[PDB]
Design a protein around this ligand. Structure first.
Ligand SMILES: [Zn+2]
Length: 173
């Protein structure tokens, strides 16, 4: 399994919501039977990482008889205005053996309809939450070519996480 460069992780999962950023997304995934698959995806040539994960589901050769928990540690919450939330809704509505957890570093405020994405994902059975120190360090330890270096928090990690978490819980009340 391949690991991402540390600077790519840090640049993409920094959770300060008031920074101007390129609209790139990184999505670290793990899939476990409730038989594991792990990896990471970014947007490529206009196709969002969420859809690329859906693209690769068949290649994972999951047993249609079993239940699987899929976890996404995603740098941006999935969009509405470019169809991600709806495709994820479709996927989950049919593939009822998949339970999806979405832990987002940041809310995708670049999408005017981001709240509709969050609400739609919830209504389809996905568990959506905001990444905390725990998740950032887990992703550093699990998906990053860190060469034994411990995780070091960026300025404001905990504050941003708590503010975004309050936003998200307010939206999904
Ligand atoms: Zn999208």
């Amino acid at each position: 399994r391949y690991l991402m460069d540390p600077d790519t992780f840090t640049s993409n999962f920094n959770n300060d919501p008031l920074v101007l950023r390129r609209r790139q997304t990184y999505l670290c995934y793990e899939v476990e039977r409730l038989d594991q698959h792990m990896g990471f995806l970014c947007n490529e040539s206009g196709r969002h990482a969420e859809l690329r994960f859906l693209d690769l589901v068949p290649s994972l050769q999951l047993d249609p008889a079993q239940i699987y928990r899929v976890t996404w540690f995603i740098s941006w919450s999935p969009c509405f205005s470019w169809g991600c939330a709806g495709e994820v809704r479709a996927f989950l509505q049919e593939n009822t053996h998949v339970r999806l957890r979405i832990k987002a570093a940041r809310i995708y405020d670049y999408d005017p309809l981001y709240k509709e994405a969050l609400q739609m994902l919830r209504d389809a059975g996905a568990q959506v939450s905001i990444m905390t120190y725990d998740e950032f360090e887990y992703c550093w330890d699990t998906f990053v070519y860190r060469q034994g270096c411990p995780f070091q928090p960026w300025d404001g990690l905990e504050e941003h996480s708590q503010a975004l978490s309050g936003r998200l819980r307010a939206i999904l009340q």
